[PDB]
Amino acid sequence: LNLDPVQLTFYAGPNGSQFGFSLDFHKDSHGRVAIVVGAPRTLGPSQEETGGVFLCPWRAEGGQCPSLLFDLRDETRNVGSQTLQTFKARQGLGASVVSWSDVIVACAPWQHWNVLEKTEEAEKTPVGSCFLAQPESGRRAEYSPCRGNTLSRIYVENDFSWDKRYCEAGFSSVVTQAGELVLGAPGGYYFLGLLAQAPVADIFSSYRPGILLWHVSSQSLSFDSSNPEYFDGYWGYSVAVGEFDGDLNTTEYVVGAPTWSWTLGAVEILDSYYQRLHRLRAEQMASYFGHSVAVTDVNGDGRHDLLVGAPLYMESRADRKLAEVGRVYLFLQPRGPHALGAPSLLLTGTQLYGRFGSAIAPLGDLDRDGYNDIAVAAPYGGPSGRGQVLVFLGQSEGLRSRPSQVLDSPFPTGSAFGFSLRGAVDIDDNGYPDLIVGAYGANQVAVYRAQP
Amino acid sequence: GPNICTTRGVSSCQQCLAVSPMCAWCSDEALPLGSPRCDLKENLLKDNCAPESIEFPVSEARVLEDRPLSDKGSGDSSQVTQVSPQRIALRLRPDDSKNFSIQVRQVEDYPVDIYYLMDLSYSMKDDLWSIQNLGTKLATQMRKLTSNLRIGFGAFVDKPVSPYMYISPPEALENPCYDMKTTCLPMFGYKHVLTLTDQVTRFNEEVKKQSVSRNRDAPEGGFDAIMQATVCDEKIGWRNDASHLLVFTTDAKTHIALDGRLAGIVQPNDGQCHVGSDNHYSASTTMDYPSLGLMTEKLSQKNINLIFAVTENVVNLYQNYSELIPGTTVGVLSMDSSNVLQLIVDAYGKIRSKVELEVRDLPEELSLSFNATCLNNEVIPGLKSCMGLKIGDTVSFSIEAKVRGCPQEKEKSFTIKPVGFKDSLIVQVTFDCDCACQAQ
Ligand SMILES: *[C@@H]1O[C@H](CO)[C@@H](O[C@@H]2O[C@H](CO)[C@@H](O[C@H]3O[C@H](CO)[C@@H](O)[C@H](O[C@@H]4O[C@H](CO)[C@@H](O)[C@H](O)[C@@H]4O)[C@@H]3O)[C@H](O)[C@H]2NC(C)=O)[C@H](O)[C@H]1NC(C)=O
Ligand SMILES: *[C@@H]1O[C@H](CO)[C@@H](O)[C@H](O)[C@H]1NC(C)=O
Ligand SMILES: *[C@@H]1O[C@H](CO)[C@@H](O)[C@H](O)[C@H]1NC(C)=O
Ligand SMILES: C[As](C)(=O)[O-]
Ligand SMILES: [Ca+2]
Ligand SMILES: [Ca+2]
Ligand SMILES: [Ca+2]
Ligand SMILES: [Ca+2]
Ligand SMILES: [Ca+2]
Ligand SMILES: [Ca+2]
Ligand SMILES: [Mg+2]
């Protein structure tokens, strides 16, 4: 249960690389446990910010980790009459990392792309891109569902239809248990937001080194809309998967659109064919409801529940004033073909500007009492404002309104302690789930162990 | 009968006055050479004293100059009078105390500062006339409400970073409109063009020389501009003693905090000034947009009233943001300026000033006390400050001067004037110690 805040392990990366911006547990083709760490500002041998990934093996001492190698140089290829070109400068490789059994997946949301044809171009824009790696065999593959070869002028005549030029694919990501990679592209369709997915096996098999624009046959992307409510919504700013329609044969997606309906924010449950199942709207504009989205069964009833962060939520203090503290929302799944009603519980921050709800990670069953628990980040929380992660335990009606444990930041100011979190994995192998906390502002990742 | 003036009577007329304000004298020989020479006035009358040789000074303090408080300012404000009795001569005997009056009226116009924030993005093209007219009509409306104004303005578009900014072809960096076969200025976050000044005609010429730029996404970085125009004291030129109005314009949505991640920007807004020599917001490409909360905090911290002049297609949206930031009004920007101008009128009518008296240069051997009477006419002793008064309102104070003995300074003067005013009450103090040459 109690995560020891003294014999905690520290891991580190280069200065300014924002090591710990993203992270995940890697259970390799072998069996030990490692920590994939993304550092989106890591310098390339060319001395330009291209980003980078680090694979950290478990060791109570911590420290430096080997770098996970990836192609860091620009590509240019001529196919017929077009010059296809990719730009990796400030692409932010590792702004999003995620391991799925054998393979690791890192993404560069900001990698630019362009196509030239005579005196017309398509534009240089952030289509983003994900790099797939199988550390054992040293193999690599790539997936960039948003690259296109349509010239600028065509979009202007189509009135910007199906414009995936600014996708920022891989901005956020998840892999279902069955091995389907799901990418969140908040810039998709001219800033509406889109989601793209394909089976990791098919991504690897269809990839050909040298081809820059290809179609992964078994892939599918969300849709463009003319409904104003979706305009500038950033649908895909965050994603998650889970079981929500009762049919265990089908998996559903949870997408965050923090700026939906004129900054009102929203979260949606969709099937694998992107057909809508439900929509949780937010309660306050600019609160960023949808920033984070977690899935887990917090009350032991056998059905997945939903957690939504709105880090910018301004709370109603006494005397007609408001205070930005952040807030999380719990939605329990009511059994059968039934709609998720209002919030079953409202956890809300206390420290001003702490951005509570900024990150939500489902721990396993910390205390082993048969009820799953969760951890919520407030990167700028605490009296000092150095950040702090709060642990909330699984009850029977939802969760305890009170934090059972409050982990404070061992790092200086601006560490952004908590911005990324990942739990529910036995790293030390003591039959108990642990918690990793990234602090990109300090370039470090802290490891908290579960002890008896 | 035996009284304190007699119990200590010694030998001089002067010494008799130095005993107490109530003591008198009598240099009349017609009195028995053993009777009370120093005593009360009534006691000296019963002792048969000639009312000619009696020396019984009294404190008076006369009003020298005192032209009434005026009732206007339009035409020519030469030197107007908003204080009562500008000069009084206070003459008092040892240890005595004389009380006088003074009253002020707020006659001068309230100092007002307006800073215009122009959305100069491409979607503003068809609105450019409207915001120029408004900016011009702004300086007019205020100038009619207050002869004391300092107007200025700045412009914004968005963060000069992909994907907001067009970064291809190479000509697009200098001319974003290049792709459309037309031409516009290069993109910029926020630019401070005209510091607050009283030169209205120069403000109007400058505002009309403004043209649009281009950006890719509808939402803009107006909030980056509101933040900067708020926290850059010296740059903007806000004058601390005055009312601060910040009019903001736009015809579209806006970027709120956490949007910057699409530009690779994650550092939360530090809420500090970043407009250097070049008059540009330098953090534009490295710092995120500010959140509603940070804005509110800063707006209050600097006492700035935010006003939204926005197009009708986005009015509801700004009304909703208006509720999340208290004390902010919203007007609908268009060719017709009636609406947004009302908000400027209202803001003025809500201004309140205060009369707080201060005492400069008063002898150490002299002390004052005040009895204030504010709006509600409720007299409260000790207090010398009134609040909540509009233009024209009048407030009065009762002052009492007290001395300790008889100073060798025989001629002095001090001033009592309210802060934020120029009109003062000068008091000439004269200490009457010596007698009319009485000898015995
Ligand atoms: C500015 O703020 C105002 C105040 O909130 C916004 O107006 C409100 O917008 C609501 C939509 O977001 C709108 O609908 C809701 O309330 C209605 C009350 O009559 C009601 O008809 C609706 O009921 C149903 O809601 C379910 C969702 O659970 C839907 O599935 C149904 O189809 C119905 O819509 C909604 O509960 C509400 O009426 C409205 N209230 C006001 C004050 O006008 C406004 O949109 C904001 N403008 C913007 C975009 O900035
Ligand atoms: C001065 O004070 C006396 C009593 O203290 C009072 O009778 C008189 O009205 C006052 N004079 C003034 C300044 O109005
Ligand atoms: C002020 O008022 C008090 C009581 O109301 C009175 O005793 C005192 O003499 C007054 N002094 C002045 C300044 O008029
Ligand atoms: C964002 As625009 C179309 O006003 O430059
Ligand atoms: Ca299912
Ligand atoms: Ca449940
Ligand atoms: Ca538990
Ligand atoms: Ca463990
Ligand atoms: Ca317009
Ligand atoms: Ca914009
Ligand atoms: Mg615009």
3-state secondary structure A229-294: HHCCCCCCCEEEEECCCCCCCCCEEEEEECCHHHHCCEEEEECCCCCEEEEEECCCCCCCCCCEEE
Helix (H, G, I), strand (E, B) or coil at B127: helix
Residue of A nearest to B293 (CA): A324
Ligand 4 atom closest to the CA of B164, numbered from 1: 1
Cβ contact A17:A42 at 8 Å: yes
Cβ contact B270:B282 at 8 Å: no
**Contacts (Cβ under 8 Å, ≥6 apart) of A84:** A75, A76, A77, A78, A115, A147, A149, A212, A213
Q: Could you name the CATH architecture of B107-353?
A: 3-Layer(aba) Sandwich (3.40)
DSSP A126: E
**Technique used:** X-ray
| Cβ <8 Å between B291 and A312 | yes
B179 lines ligand 3 (CB under 6 A): no
Cβ contact B361:B414 at 8 Å: yes
Q: Which two tokens stand for residue B432?
A: 């009457």
Distance CA B313, CA B319 (A): 12
Residue A238 bridge partners (DSSP): A256
Mutate to test the pocket of ligand 1, among A278, A284, A285, A289 (most ligand atoms within 8 A of CB): A285
Distance CA A427, CA A430 (A): 8
User: Residue B437 burial by CB count (10 A; 0-12/13-18/19+): exposed, middle or buried?
Assistant: exposed
Distance CA A32, CA A55 (A): 12
Ligand approaching nearest to the C-alpha of B124: 9
Ligand 9 is an ion; its neighbours by CB within 5 Å are B 123, 126-127, 251
Give the Å distance between the CA of A341 and the centre of ligand 5.
19
Residue of A nearest to B257 (CA): A286
What is the tally of structural domains in chain A?
Answer: 1
Question: Residue B290: its chain A contacts at CB < 8 A?
Answer: none
How many residues are there in chain A? 452
| Cβ <8 Å between A232 and B257 | no
Distance to chain A for B321, nearest Cα, Å: 8
Distance CA A31, CA A426 (A): 12
How far lies B290's CA from each of A157, B116, B258, in Å? 36, 19, 8
| Cβ <8 Å between A121 and B320 | no
Tell me the residue ranges of DSSP E strands in B198-303: 243-250
In the sheet where A327-331 sits, what is the strand order?
Answer: A292-296, A305-309, A327-331, A345-348
| Cβ <8 Å between A125 and B162 | yes
B370 lines ligand 2 (CB under 6 A): no
Question: Residue B257: its chain A contacts at CB < 8 A?
Answer: 286, 288, 312
What is the interface size between A and B, counted as CB pairs within 8 Å? 93
The dihedral sign for the CA sequence B44, B46, B51, B52: negative
DSSP A43: B
Q: Which of A92, A259, A353 sits opposite B264 (nearest CB)?
A: A92
Annotated binding-site residues of A read: 243, 245, 247, 250, 252, 297, 299, 301, 303, 305, 365, 367, 369, 371, 373, 426, 428, 430, 432, 434
Helix (H, G, I), strand (E, B) or coil at A78: strand
Cβ contact B424:B86 at 8 Å: yes
**Contacts (Cβ under 8 Å, ≥6 apart) of A447:** A8, A9, A10, A11, A35, A62, A427, A434, A435, A436, A437
| Cβ <8 Å between B296 and A284 | no
Give the best residue of A21, A49, A166, A351 to mutate against chain B (max B CB count within 10 A).
Answer: A166
The 3-state secondary structure of A138-188, one letter per residue: CEEEEECCCCCCCCHHHHHHHCCCCCCCCCCECCEEEECCCCEEEEEECCH
Q: How many CA atoms lie within 13 A of A80 on its CB side?
A: 6
CATH of B58-106+354-440, one of 3.40.50.2300, 3.20.20.60, 3.40.50.170, 2.60.40.1510: 2.60.40.1510
Q: Which two tokens stand for residue A269?
A: 């449950």
B101 lines ligand 2 (CB under 6 A): yes
How far lies A246's CA from each of A123, A251, A277, A333, in Å? 44, 10, 12, 10
Ligand 2 atom closest to the CA of B399, numbered from 1: 13
Helix (H), strand (E) at residue B317 = helix B315-323
Domain range for A75:
1-452
Beta pairing, strands B243-250 & B112-119: parallel
Q: Where in chain B is the domain with CATH 3.30.1680.10?
A: 1-57
Q: Is the peptide bond before B169 cis (omega within 30 degrees of 0)?
A: yes
DSSP A216: -
Distance CA B70, CA B111 (A): 19
Residues from B in contact with A at Cβ < 8 Å: 162-163, 166-169, 179, 216-219, 253, 256-259, 261-262, 264, 266, 268, 291-294, 296, 317, 320-321, 324, 326
Cβ contact A216:A200 at 8 Å: no
Report CA B67 to chain centroid distance, whole Å: 25
User: Residue A387 burial by CB count (10 A; 0-12/13-18/19+): exposed, middle or buried?
Assistant: buried
| Cβ <8 Å between B257 and A312 | yes
Count CB-CB contacts under 10 A for residue B297. 18
Q: Where in chain B is the domain with CATH 2.60.40.1510?
A: 58-106+354-440
Phi and psi based region of residue A167 (left: phi greater than 0; alpha: psi -120 to 50; beta: remaining): alpha
Q: Which residue has the tokens 């995120």?
A: B288
B338-349 and B128-145 are packed helices; what angle lies between their axes, rounded to 10 degrees?
30
Distance CA A11, CA A59 (A): 9
Give Rg (Cα) of chain A.
Answer: 21
Instruction: Please report, for the domain that includes residue A276, its CATH number.
Output: 2.130.10.130
**Contacts (Cβ under 8 Å, ≥6 apart) of A220:** A196, A197, A198, A272, A273, A274
Distance CA A35, CA A47 (A): 26
Distance to chain A for B262, nearest Cα, Å: 8
This structure's resolution (Å) is: 2.9
Distance CA B258, CA A287 (A): 10
Q: Which two tokens stand for residue B150?
A: 């300092």
Helix (H, G, I), strand (E, B) or coil at A367: coil
**Contacts (Cβ under 8 Å, ≥6 apart) of A402:** none
Distance CA A359, CA A376 (A): 6
Name the CATH superfamily for B1-57: ligand-binding face of the semaphorins, domain 2 (3.30.1680.10)
Cβ contact A427:A447 at 8 Å: yes
| Cβ <8 Å between A285 and B321 | yes
Distance to chain B for A323, nearest Cα, Å: 7
How far lies B49's CA from each of B6, B16, B32, B58, B143, in Å? 15, 16, 11, 19, 70
Q: Where in chain B is the domain with CATH 3.40.50.410?
A: 107-353
